[PDB]
Design a protein around this nucleic acid. Structure first.
Lengths: 71, 162, 74, 82, 79, 83, 98, 94, 74
RNA sequence: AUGGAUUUUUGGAGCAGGGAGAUGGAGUCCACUCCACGCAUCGACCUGGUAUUGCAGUACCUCCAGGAACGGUGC
C-alpha cells in the first residue's frame, strides 16, 4: 500500500547497523530498491570516526532505528 | 530565560567542524543548567558559551556527551557527581569563568575519560602551583590549557603533594 | 541493463588482480563479458609464500573478482 | 503460494524474529513489504551476547531474517486463504 | 578480443585437463576434463580429482558435475 | 529505471572519494567512472590496508558488489536531490 | 506447469508433507535442526511450520556457573513459526511422522 | 588585507596530529564566536598552518587581536586575516 | 563424448546411485529421484558421509540447490 | 492481481584459537615464563633528536633512532 515506511524516516537522524556489526549514524536523506542509503553528516561507532557524506550499499545493511529528529 | 525543554527544541542543531553532533545553546543568558533530558542524549557536543551559569551541575545521564564548551559564563563551582551523569566526558573548555580555589577543581578528578581541559582566564590560574596541582589531582588529563602534560611535570607534581 | 563493464580501456594491458580468499594473480586482459568474467593471458599466481608460478591463459569468474589494478598507464 | 503475502497480513501482531546474525527481535509489526523488509514498534532487541535494548521503532532488511516465531493464537488457516 | 565463455568452449573441444579454483576454499581445488557446460558455468568434468594443496593428496571422483557457484578460476594443466 | 543514490554517485565522478571494500581495504582518490552496478574506476590512489599500512596506485577498478561503501564530497549535499 | 514442478520435482518432498500433514526434519544453516509439520511452503523454501521441535548443540554457555568443557544438546518447542528459505540446507522426509 | 571571516594562523607546532590540532583549535577559538569550519593540512606546503572560519566577522577580529602570539602547544601563534574569502563563506552568502 | 552438457548428464543420472558433496563438506549418498531447473535435488535411501565416514542413514531427502558443490554418480 | 543462477532481497556460511611446566588462582577460563616475543607487511600511535614559516578546501604527510598498546591482510 503506502510505501511510506522508509519515506517517513527520511530527513531524520538514523542509527544503521552493518553486517560486520558497525554502527553508522547519519541523516537519512535517500534510499532505493536495494536499500542503498544516503547518509549526511555521518559518523561511525564500534571508538568514533567522522565520515561525512556516506553512500552505503544495501547488501551490507542489516537494520535501522530512529536516533534523533531532523537537523 | 530558563534553560527549558522548549528552548532546547528550537535550538540550532548541526554537525560541527570536528564532525560531531553539537547543540547550540549560546547567548541565551541561562543561569542554571537544567532539563537536559529533552536533548535525548543525541549530542556529542553542547555549546554553552556566553551564558550566566554559576555551577557545572544539573546534568541527566548523558552517555553520548563528549565535549562541553562553557566559555564566558560565571562558573565558580563544579558539581560532585559529574562522572555518574557524564561517563565519557572527554573535553571540557572552561575559559573565562570564575574558579578561584585549587580545591574547587577537585571534582574533575572523578571524570575518568577527561583528556582535554582548559581553565584559562580563571583567577585560579595565578595560584601558586596551579598547573602541578591539576596534573597530580586530574592525571587523566593529557592536554591542559592547550599545552601537553609532560612526564617531567608529572614527576614534579609527584614530589610536591606526594 | 545487461550492461557491459567499462573495460575496453584495460584491454591488452598487464593487470594485478585481487581475488577472494586473499588470492592475487597478474596477467594481460584478453576479454570480458557482462558478468565481468575475464580472460587473462600469461597469468601468474602470486602465492602467499612470495613465490610466483606461471599458469598461462586463464578464465577468472567475475563473481570472485574483488579488485583490479593496472600495472600499465591507460 | 507467495508466502511474503502471508507475512504482509501480520501488521499489529507481536512476534519474535531470529536473525541470520543470531540477533533476536521481539516487537509489534507495523509492516512487511514484498522484499520481506519488516518494520516494527515497541521493540526489545537482543543482539547475541548482549542485554536487550528497547527501541520505539526498528526496520529490518528482509534477507537478514532467519525466521519468525508467531503468536500461538495465530489462525493460520484463515491467513493462508487468498 | 577473447570472450571467457569461448575460452571454455575451447577447453571443451581441446579436452585439455582443467584445474578449477574454488570459492572461499583454498586448501582444495578440483581437476577434470570438461565434457560440457551450461549458461550458469556449471561444468561436466571427466576423470575428476580433488586436490589437497596442504596434504598433497588426491581424491578420485570420475564423473562430476560441478556447480558454477564455486568457480573462482579456470586453468589448464599439461598432465 | 535508476536509483536516487546512483544518480548522486554519478554526480561525484571527477571528485576525490573514499571507498571501502568488502574486505576493509580503504581506497582514496579520484573517481573517474562509476557504473550503474557500482563498478568504480579510480586514479592516483592511496590504499590503507587492514594492518594500517599505506600504498600508492595510479589506476584501479573495483567491482560494485565487492564494495561495502563510499564516502563522497560534501560539495554534493546541497542539491538538486533534496525532495 | 509450476504446480507440476512443485508436484513431481524435488519440492514434492514439501508438497507431500503439506498434503499428508507429516513431519519433516530441516537441517538448517544456523547449525540447528527444525522438526515439525509443513503448513505452507514456497519456491525459496520459506515455510510456515507447526509443532516445531528445534534441536541443536552447544558447549556450556558460561553465564554464572563453571566451565565443564563438554558438548551439550539442547531443544525447545515452538508451536507456530515462519522460516525464511535461504537458511535451508536440507529437508528430510521419513518414517518420522509414524 | 581587510578584515575577514577567516583567519590564517601560522607558526604552529606541526608535530600535533591533524585531528587533535583541529579539535584544540576549535576549542580555543570557540570563546569568540561560533567557528563554522577549520581547514588544516599536513602537506609540506600547508603544515604548521590553519584557516579558522567564523560565522560572525566581529568574532574573527576579536580572535585576531586577543590571541596574537598565544602560546599553543609550545609556540607563539601568528594570526592574520586570510587573503581570500573561504569557500564555505561564499556559499553561505549566495 | 560429443558435447555432454550439465542438464542431460544429471537427467541420465536420475534413477541412479549418486553422491552429492555440499559446500560445507557434508556428503550424501542415495538414489537420485529427480532434479529441477534450479538444480535442487531429491535423494532416496540417502546416507550421510561426513569426514568420508558413514554417519547417519536418512531416507528421502531434499537438498536446496545453493548448498551443492558437486554431484557424482557412483 | 508480482521476482532463489555472478554487482544488492531467499546467503559461502559454520566452527575452532599451537605445545609444555612438581606453574598460581577461580574439564573450562584468566595471568606469567620457555620453545616458534605465533612469523612477515602497511597505517595510526608512544619517547627523544631534527627539517620546514608555508594563504588553504584534504586517502595519509619532514627525517633519524628507539619503544611497541591497537587495527587489517597472508602463511
Amino acid at each position: 500500500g503506502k510505501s511510506s515506511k522508509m519515506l517517513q524516516h527520511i530527513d531524520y537522524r538514523m542509527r544503521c547497523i552493518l553486517q560486520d556489526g558497525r554502527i553508522f549514524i547519519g541523516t537519512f536523506k535517500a534510499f532505493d530498491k536495494h536499500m542503498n542509503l544516503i547518509l549526511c553528516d555521518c559518523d561511525e561507532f564500534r571508538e568514533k570516526r567522522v565520515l561525512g557524506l556516506v553512500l552505503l550499499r544495501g547488501e551490507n545493511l542489516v537494520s535501522m532505528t530512529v536516533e534523533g529528529p531532523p537537523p | 530565560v530558563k534553560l527549558t525543554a522548549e528552548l532546547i527544541e528550537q535550538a540550532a542543531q548541526y554537525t560541527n567542524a570536528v564532525r560531531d553532533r553539537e547543540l547550540d545553546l549560546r547567548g541565551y543568558k541561562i543561569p542554571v543548567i537544567e532539563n537536559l533530558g529533552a536533548t535525548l542524549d543525541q549530542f556529542d557536543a553542547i555549546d554553552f558559551s556566553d551564558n550566566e551559569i554559576r555551577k557545572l551541575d544539573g546534568f541527566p545521564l548523558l552517555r553520548r556527551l563528549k565535549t562541553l564548551l562553557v566559555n564566558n559564563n560565571r562558573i565558580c563551582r563544579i558539581g560532585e557527581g559529574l562522572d555518574q551523569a557524564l561517563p565519557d566526558l572527554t573535553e571540557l573548555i572552561l575559559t573565562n569563568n570564575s574558579l578561584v580555589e585549587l580545591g574547587d577543581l577537585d571534582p574533575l578528578a572523578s571524570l575518568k575519560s577527561l583528556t582535554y581541559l582548559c581553565i584559562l582566564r580563571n583567577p585560579v590560574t595565578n595560584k601558586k602551583h596551579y598547573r602541578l596541582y591539576v596534573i597530580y589531582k586530574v592525571p587523566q588529563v593529557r592536554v591542559l590549557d592547550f599545552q601537553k602534560v609532560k612526564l617531567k611535570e608529572r614527576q614534579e607534581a609527584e614530589k610536591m603533594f606526594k | 541493463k545487461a550492461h557491459p563493464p567499462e573495460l575496453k580501456k584495460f584491454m591488452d594491458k598487464k593487470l594485478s588482480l585481487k581475488l577472494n580468499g586473499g588470492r592475487h594473480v597478474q596477467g594481460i586482459l584478453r576479454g570480458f563479458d557482462p558478468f565481468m568474467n575475464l580472460v587473462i593471458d600469461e597469468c601468474v599466481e602470486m602465492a602467499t609464500s612470495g613465490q610466483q608460478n606461471n599458469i598461462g591463459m586463464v578464465v577468472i569468474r567475475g563473481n570472485s573478482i574483488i579488485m583490479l589494478e593496472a600495472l600499465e598507464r591507460v | 503460494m507467495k508466502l511474503v503475502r502471508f507475512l504482509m497480513k501480520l501488521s499489529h501482531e507481536t512476534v519474535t524474529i531470529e536473525l541470520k546474525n543470531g540477533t533476536q527481535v521481539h516487537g509489534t509489526i507495523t509492516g512487511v513489504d514484498v522484499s520481506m523488509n519488516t518494520h516494527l514498534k515497541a521493540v526489545k532487541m537482543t543482539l547475541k551476547n548482549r542485554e536487550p535494548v528497547q527501541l520505539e521503532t526498528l526496520s529490518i532488511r528482509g534477507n537478514n531474517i532467519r525466521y519468525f516465531i508467531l503468536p500461538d493464537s495465530l489462525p493460520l488457516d484463515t491467513l493462508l486463504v487468498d | 578480443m577473447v570472450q571467457p565463455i569461448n575460452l571454455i568452449f575451447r577447453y571443451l573441444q581441446n579436452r585439455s585437463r582443467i584445474q578449477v579454483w574454488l570459492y572461499e576454499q583454498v586448501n582444495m581445488r578440483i581437476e577434470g576434463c570438461i565434457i560440457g557446460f551450461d549458461e550458469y558455468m556449471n561444468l561436466v568434468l571427466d576423470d575428476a580429482e580433488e586436490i589437497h594443496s596442504k596434504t598433497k593428496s588426491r581424491k578420485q571422483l570420475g564423473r562430476i558435475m560441478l556447480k558454477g557457484d564455486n568457480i573462482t578460476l579456470l586453468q589448464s594443466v599439461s598432465n | 529505471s535508476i536509483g536516487v543514490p546512483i544518480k548522486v554517485l554519478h554526480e561525484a565522478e571527477g571528485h576525490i572519494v573514499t571507498c571501502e571494500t568488502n574486505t576493509g581495504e580503504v581506497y582514496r582518490g579520484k573517481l573517474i567512472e562509476a557504473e550503474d552496478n557500482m563498478n568504480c574506476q579510480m586514479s592516483n590512489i592511496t590504499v590503507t590496508y587492514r594492518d594500517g599500512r599505506v600504498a600508492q596506485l595510479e589506476q584501479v577498478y573495483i567491482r560494485g558488489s565487492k564494495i561495502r561503501f563510499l564516502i563522497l564530497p560534501d560539495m554534493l549535499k546541497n542539491a538538486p536531490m533534496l525532495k | 506447469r509450476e504446480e507440476e514442478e512443485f508436484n513431481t520435482g524435488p519440492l514434492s518432498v514439501l508438497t507431500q508433507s503439506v498434503k499428508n500433514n507429516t513431519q519433516v526434519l530441516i537441517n538448517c544453516r544456523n547449525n540447528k535442526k527444525l522438526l515439525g509439520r509443513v503448513k505452507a511452503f514456497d519456491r525459496h523454501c520459506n515455510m510456515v511450520l507447526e509443532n516445531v521441535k528445534e534441536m541443536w548443540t552447544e558447549v556450556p554457555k558460561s553465564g554464572k556457573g563453571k566451565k565443564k568443557s563438554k558438548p551439550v544438546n539442547k531443544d525447545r518447542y515452538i508451536s507456530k513459526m515462519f522460516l525464511r528459505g535461504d537458511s535451508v540446507i536440507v529437508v528430510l522426509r521419513n518414517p518420522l511422522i509414524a | 588585507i581587510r578584515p575577514n571571516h577567516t583567519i590564517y594562523i601560522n607558526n604552529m607546532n606541526d608535530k600535533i596530529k591533524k585531528e587533535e590540532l583541529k579539535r584544540s583549535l576549535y576549542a580555543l577559538f570557540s570563546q569568540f564566536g561560533h567557528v563554522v569550519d577549520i581547514v588544516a593540512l599536513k602537506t609540506m606546503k600547508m603544515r604548521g598552518q590553519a584557516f579558522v572560519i567564523f560565522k560572525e566577522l566581529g568574532s574573527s577580529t576579536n580572535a585576531l587581536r586577543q590571541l596574537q602570539g598565544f602560546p599553543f602547544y609550545g609556540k607563539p601563534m601568528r594570526i592574520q586575516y586570510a587573503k581570500t574569502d573561504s569557500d564555505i563563506i561564499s556559499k553561505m552568502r549566495g | 563424448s560429443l558435447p555432454l552438457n550439465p542438464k542431460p548428464f544429471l537427467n541420465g543420472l536420475t534413477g541412479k546411485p549418486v553422491m552429492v558433496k555440499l559446500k560445507w563438506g557434508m556428503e550424501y549418498k542415495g538414489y537420485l529421484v529427480s532434479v529441477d531447473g534450479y538444480m535442487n535435488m531429491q535423494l532416496a535411501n540417502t546416507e550421510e558421509y561426513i569426514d568420508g565416514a558413514l554417519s547417519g542413514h536418512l531416507g528421502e531427502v531434499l537438498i536446496r540447490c545453493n548448498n551443492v558443490l558437486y554431484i557424482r554418480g557412483v
